[PDB]
Point group: C2
Chain length 85, copies 2
């Protein structure tokens, strides 16, 4: 179950973040490995520098670049994915 | 209980991160509020731009600036605090 909590990026790029994180979860179970996959994909497909956080329990306060921020769940796993401002 | 998992910052600044996160935990229970406190303090005391993640369960893959990265626990709460490279 995909739930977008907070986004500041295109509806398209959001769907890509979702699809990429889904792929990550199917391959890996370790959270930094899940985070690595998403991070690297976005650096590839949207240019560096992206950062990624994956976990069942976290909160954050980061400074992001406009249109380059998403925070979402897939089931019980939350994913934060952004470029720094 | 303070446990440094991964640091790339001075032994001094590490101790400050620890002390600041401790203060945060005593005032706030909500993870983004805990993260806000730490973030803002470091932007104040070490210059912007810092980012902070606080949670009981997460992993990450981020790109950090040399000497500006710490990942640590205080009890069951893990704290990630860094400047982007």
């Amino acid at each position: 179950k995909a739930v977008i909590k907070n986004a500041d990026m295109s509806e398209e790029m959001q769907q890509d973040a979702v699809d990429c994180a889904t792929q990550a979860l199917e391959k890996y179970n370790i959270e930094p490995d899940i985070a690595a996959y998403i991070k690297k994909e976005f650096d590839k497909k949207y240019n560096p520098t992206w950062h990624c956080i994956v976990g069942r329990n976290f909160g954050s306060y980061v400074t992001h670049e406009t249109r380059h921020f998403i925070y979402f769940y897939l089931g019980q796993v939350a994913i934060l994915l952004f470029k720094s401002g």
